[PDB]
Every structure is written in structure tokens, then in C-alpha cells.
Design an enzyme around this catalytic site. Structure first.
Site, PDB file in Angstrom:
ATOM      1  CD1 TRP A  61      -2.751   1.446   0.173  1.00  0.00           C
ATOM      2  CD2 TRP A  61      -2.467   1.754   2.378  1.00  0.00           C
ATOM      3  NE1 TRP A  61      -3.645   2.401   0.581  1.00  0.00           N
ATOM      4  CE2 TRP A  61      -3.495   2.611   1.927  1.00  0.00           C
ATOM      5  CE3 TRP A  61      -2.115   1.775   3.733  1.00  0.00           C
ATOM      6  CZ2 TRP A  61      -4.169   3.476   2.787  1.00  0.00           C
ATOM      7  CZ3 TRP A  61      -2.782   2.633   4.581  1.00  0.00           C
ATOM      8  CH2 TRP A  61      -3.795   3.468   4.111  1.00  0.00           C
ATOM      9  CG  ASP A 106      -2.677  -2.882   7.076  1.00  0.00           C
ATOM     10  OD1 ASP A 106      -3.825  -2.771   7.556  1.00  0.00           O
ATOM     11  OD2 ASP A 106      -2.196  -2.099   6.231  1.00  0.00           O
ATOM     12  CE  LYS A 159     -10.061  -0.172   2.373  1.00  0.00           C
ATOM     13  NZ  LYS A 159      -8.639  -0.439   2.600  1.00  0.00           N
TER      14      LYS A 159
END
Ligand code: CL
Lengths: 404, 401
Positions: free
Chosen positions: A136, A217, A253
Site C-alpha cells: 500500500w 495490517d 471496507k
């Protein structure tokens, strides 16, 4: 006259590439245009999706006529506990022993930053954080701004558009002992390439042997496969092997709470005493950053997690979202064969989550933009959320034309 | 071994410790004058009716929950700048500013501090008033700046040490950062008068200092938002390109929603654009983007004439409640037979009051009357109500007579 101001020397920052793609998409006049750079879930009509369970949770909360007073530094206790339970599982010994601290954060980014700041202050062994290649975009500046140094380990294999298991294990096995290793729990962003369970087990063995600190993560629990337990399996496996990981959770999300900024940072500790000391220092770090976290999103998440009917409905909705993404991957591959493509597209269905490394070259990406108004980043990453039942056929045709 | 064997327990929080001790006390007459938020006359949390109406307006629109831009909700940022600077501000007309949404006032302070750390090549020193908000020091220290102090509170008068402040500010190295509370100084409640502000502005301009304003109490302080922001606006008028940290925690009661803004006043729009780009570069690796719930509420209030009017009325009532308790405390002290000068209690502004009580008197108030406050003699005026102001005055009289 000296006409200098305080900020004469402050340069204009560079253009954001991903933003540039969506901006270019907006300007395009082609009615058939597709935005495969969209950075959030979309339904099959290509529209933002507020989960019904979230709407119902909002109604539950609104009826209670709650105040808007400050949360504790570490956030809503109810949310923190429920968040830990979601990640670790109901049968977790960590939960039962209380050898953990969970603090509410400003979504997943906030958790990453708090985690990084904690490492900077207390992880004296090394400054090096090993990120997968690629990772990311925000990972590097998060750790850099926090005062850490960034290193890399092989992850994505360009030859297969899959996991470079051999390369990853080789690199991790050479990471200096007592270094920090960042791992995506599932749905690797941006490739969608995840280790299989048996591969995870090998990675865990090396991490344990070389005494590495595992920094997870987890932004896509449930959203990735539709099964929250499966998605969190790697995290739970590491903990079972005696690796006291830390974990960054996002509800952006999986609950669609993007803008509400709902997340948590968890540190698994030796015992409750260690967790208490870590908690005190986490609070000392949080307070001078933003004092205390936002209420609205935490209340919604807590309400969903702790109300049985809502939790069940939410998990149903998450599965449908995960299945939509899996469906678009499956339909893209099927349509590509129908179009007569002889290229191997198995990676599209092997990958997990709403981000897919297609293996398309920059020249092919450029042709997709010009000829078909299909917008994606130059690395060949597509957002599967930008694909619907109405345009998946068009996408497959276009990809065939530029690769044939 | 373990990763965190060397991680020690943090020191006790004095402010929280007062509230915790208050909670344990079994005295039915107990008072918490350490509460760090507004309370109504019944001692209860207060959600503004205008906020409830704003929520109803928003809920009806069936809005999504998608990410805001890095700098937050555009209409909130613009409305927030207008609130601070005033509708007819030349700053707005010329567009020589950038406003970004932040995680309330603390977030604005931290973003500002991070911006200074990265780009303020002229100094590492940030001058704080003596005393100041407890969180100020760690915000700037964690951000990577150095802290200094200037005289502000005068313990002899329980008022503003104008002479000492101007003296200290006049000797601050040129191009240092000076932090100023816009109004309702926390924790003393002591503010410069307008004429005093003017002379401070002159020294700031002469010494070429960077003025960093913390404005957490616009409207809440006096009930008049224009009066409360006057000092900030005056500095700008005098050609001082300040930055400003706004909070909507108090004045809209949006505490836990985390609604705030950071504004940089710039030379021109071009400079603002460059500063904006770098602010976003700093924000994204901290929390990516800010929360949408509170910003939508604040924007709805500010940009809906009816709600704005109702909000400003509610703000005035809240400010007048605090002013009323200050007035009634002094009046009751006089009726109790106190011969001490308590004018400072009514001269001070905001919900925090330096009473001038000594540590020994604070301890007696706790033990004898179960009236809880910090050892510095700071009281939260929000903890004072119509029902307990008499008891408080009697107690203070007893320990000071
Ligand atoms: Cl267009």
C-alpha cells in the site's frame, strides 16, 4: 524590498497518480467508460453501498438519544473489546487471559500510525520495517513520518502474477533478528496475492526462529473471502505459534464505514500486566495526536458486533459483497476465454480482494484508456469494484484486444 | 524475555485523578469542579437543539459514508474559515488562506506543529504562555519542536501580567513561534483586553514572530463570536499571517465527534495552494482522511440560516450560564461575609477559573466539603449550578476567612 513570506520556500507537492486516474476518468466523455481506479466498494450498479445493517444500527443508536461527550483516550471500551473478539476469535486464549490491549484509532491508517509511533518510542532493537514488494502506497510515509526506516522483501511474482514464496522466505530468512516485518493479513493491496495457509505456516516458523516482530495490517477481514474466520486465520496462527503480533483493523471496507473512520490497534502481550503498561504508553502517544477518537462510527460498529441479529445480518451482507468481487473475477476470466484469449488469466481468480494485478503492461494500459476509456493505474492494478455485470463483457473484450 | 519488558507504566493524570477521586467520594453534596466539558444547570451533558435539528436534516438526505478528501469536507472548511475570519474578511476576498478539516482542535494543533517541524526553517522554538493547556507541550514535543515559556498569568492579581508578557515577548528571538489563546485562556480564564492585544500585535510584528492561535472557544467564551475572534482578526489586519486552530467541541458541543479545522493565512492564493499540498502530504500518513459525521453537522448549522441563528442563540445561553455562575459565586461570597477581592472570578472568561485558592485550601475543600478541584486552584465553572453555587460560596468562605 524583501518580499519573502514564511512559506516562499514551500514547494508544491507532486501529483497523486491514483487521484489523477479518477480525475481523467471523470473528464472522459465516453459513455462506456470504466473507473478501475476506484478505491472503495461499489455495488453491481456501480454506486456507493451503505450496508442495511449499518442503517439499522444508526436507527438503534438515534433512538437512545445519546450524548456526544468525549470518549476515553483509547476510545469506546465496548467497541475495543468487540473489535478484539472479531480479530482473535471467540475461542482465543488471548481474550480469555486478557494478554492484549486494543485501542480505537482513526480507521486502519490511524492504527498503522499509532503502531509505528509505538515502535519508534519503545522498539529499541531496530528502526527497520520490512514491507512487501509492492505494498500500500501510504505504508512508506506512515512509518517514515513516525521516524522508522523502510526495507523491502520479495512478495509479488511478476512471472506468475502470484506469490513469490521462495523469494519471500529467502528474504525473510535474511532479515536481521529483532526487526519489524509488516504482513497483510489477507487481500494484499495492491496485488490481491495472498500466501496459502501452508505457506503462512512456513513464514511463521521463520518469523519465530529469527525473533522478528510481526506487524499485521488487516483491512479486509470478511470482505476478502466472505468468511471472517478464514480471513483472520494467518493472524490467529501466528499468535498460536507464540508470536505476540500487533494488529491494525479497519472497518472502512467490511462495514462500509469509510468516512466514519473506524479502526483499532491491538498489541498481543505476554500477560495482562504487560498489556496494562503498553496501554498506558499508547494513551500517552494518542493524546498529543488527537486527544480522543470519533464516536459515531465506533457506536455503529459496537452496535453491529454486540447485537446478535445485526451481527448475523452484517455477516450476510459482507459475504454478498465478497461474492460480488469473486464473481467479477470469475466472470472476467470466463469472458476472456470466450473472447478467445490464450493468455493464462488464472491469477485473476487466484487473487483475493477488490484489487487485482492483471499483469497488463503500461502500453496496454495506455491503449485501454485511449481506445476503450477503461481507466486504471500504469502498474496494471484494477479495482474489481469498478467491474459490474453490465461492463465485465466489455472489459474482457478490451483486455483481449490489447493482449491478443 | 518479552518485547515490552522495559515499557513502564505512565505517570498518573492529575486531572483524571480528581474526577476519579470525586466518583469514589460518598458525600451526597460532592461537587466536581474538574469536569472538562460543558454541563447544563442540572449538571448533565448538553446536546444543542440546533445539533439535533442538523442531524434530522442530514438523516433525511440518505447520504453515503464515502471517504472525504484528505483535507476534509470542502463546504465545512469554507464555512469554518468564514466563521473565524468574518464574512467580509480581505483574506476570504483575496483567497490567501488554506483551511483543512482536522480531528478537532487537538488535531489542528498537531497538524500545525507537524507543518512547523517540516517547513519552519527559522526556528525550533514554540513559546507557550505560563500556564497553558497541559496537552500543548506534548503536542509540539512529539511533533519535534522545542518548548519555551512567556509570562501570562499574574498570581498577585489573578489576572493578566501585561507588563511581564510584553517584556518576555519583546525578548523572544526573531522568527520564533508564539502560541496565543484567542480567547478564554485555559486554564486561567485570563484574557488580554483589546487594547493590550494591540500592543502585543505590534511587538509580534516588530520582532517578526510567527503567531500560532489556538481558538477552542469562539462564541462559547462571551456569547459573541465576533468579539471572541477579534484578536485573531486584528493580528491579520496588522499584516501578521497567523495560523489558527479551531475546535467545535465546546461551541457546538460536538466533543466526541472530533470536529475542528486548521487555517494558514498566507501571502497570496498561490502560497495557500502550495501550503495546502504539503498539509495533505502530512495528513495522509497520520489518518488518511477525517471523520464525516461531525463535519456534516457543523456545515449544516453554519450554512443553514435558520440553524445558524438558533445555534448562535444557544451558544449565547451557554456562555451566559457560565457568566451567571461566576457572577453568582462572587455575589454569594459577598453575602457570606467574605472580605477578599473576588473580582477576578467575574473578570475571567470561559469555563475555567483560577480562583487563587492555595493548595492547603484546596485540600480542605476536598476533605470537609467534598468539592473537588486541581491543586492549582483551577475550577471548572461548568461544575457550578444554581443548586450548588450557594454551597460552594459558603465552602470557599470557610476556608479563606
Ligand atoms: Cl464528461
Amino acid at each position: 524590498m524583501d518580499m519573502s513570506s514564511w512559506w516562499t520556500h514551500v514547494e508544491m507537492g507532486p501529483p497523486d497518480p491514483i487521484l489523477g486516474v479518477t480525475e481523467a476518468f471523470k473528464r472522459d466523455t465516453n459513455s462506456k467508460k470504466m473507473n478501475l481506479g476506484v478505491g472503495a466498494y461499489r455495488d453491481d450498479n456501480g454506486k456507493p453501498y451503505v450496508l442495511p445493517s449499518v442503517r439499522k444500527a444508526e436507527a438503534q443508536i438515534a433512538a437512545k438519544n445519546l450524548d456526544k461527550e468525549y470518549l476515553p483516550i483509547g476510545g469506546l471500551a465496548e467497541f475495543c473489546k468487540a473489535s478484539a473478539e472479531l480479530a482473535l476469535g471467540e475461542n482465543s486464549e488471548v481474550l480469555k487471559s486478557g494478554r492484549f490491549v486494543t485501542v480505537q484509532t482513526i480507521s486502519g491508517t490511524g492504527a498503522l500510525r499509532i503502531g509505528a509511533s509505538f515502535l519508534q518510542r519503545f522498539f529499541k532493537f531496530s528502526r527497520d520495517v520490512f514491507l512487501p514488494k509492492p505494498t500500500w502506497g501510504n505504508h512508506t510515509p506512515i512509518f517514515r513520518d513516525a521516524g522508522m526506516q523502510l526495507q523491502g522483501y520479495r512478495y509479488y511474482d511478476p512471472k506468475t502474477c502470484g506469490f513469490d514464496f521462495t523469494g519471500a522466505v529467502e528474504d525473510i530468512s535474511k532479515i536481521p533478528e529483532q526487526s519489524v516485518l509488516l504482513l497483510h493479513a489477507c487481500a494484499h493491496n495492491p496485488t490481491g496475492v495472498d500466501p496459502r495457509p501452508e505457506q503462512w505456516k512456513e513464514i511463521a516458523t521463520v518469523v519465530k526462529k529469527r525473533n522478528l516482530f510481526a506487524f499485521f495490517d488487516m483491512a479486509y477481514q470478511g470482505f476478502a473471502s466472505g468468511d471472517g474466520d478464514k480471513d483472520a486465520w494467518a493472524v490467529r496462527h501466528f499468535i498460536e505459534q507464540g508470536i505476540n503480533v500487533c494488529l491494525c483493523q479497519s472497518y472502512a471496507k467490511n462495514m462500509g464505514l469509510y468516512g466514519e473512520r473506524v479502526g483499532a490497534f491491538t498489541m498481543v502481550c505476554k500477560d495482562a500486566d504487560e498489556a496494562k503498561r503498553v496501554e498506558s504508553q499508547l494513551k500517552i502517544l494518542i493524546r498529543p495526536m488527537y486527544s480522543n477518537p470519533p464516536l459515531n462510527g465506533a457506536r455503529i460498529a459496537a452496535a453491529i458486533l454486540n447485537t446478535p441479529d445485526l451481527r448475523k445480518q452484517w455477516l450476510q451482507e459482507v459475504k454478498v459483497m465478497a461474492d460480488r468481487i469473486i464473481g467479477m473475477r470469475t466472470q472476467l476470466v470466463s469472458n476472456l476465454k470466450k473472447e478467445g484469449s490464450t493468455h493464462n488469466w488464472q491469477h485473476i481468480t487466484d487473487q483475493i480482494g477488490m484489487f487485482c494485478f492483471t499483469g497488463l503492461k503500461p502500453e496496454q494500459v495506455e491503449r485501454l484508456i485511449k481506445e476503450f476509456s477503461i481507466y486504471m493505474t500504469k502498474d496494471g492494478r484494477i479495482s474489481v469494484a469498478g467491474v459490474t455485470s453490465s461492463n465485465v463483457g466489455y472489459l474482457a473484450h478490451a483486455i483481449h484486444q490489447v493482449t491478443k
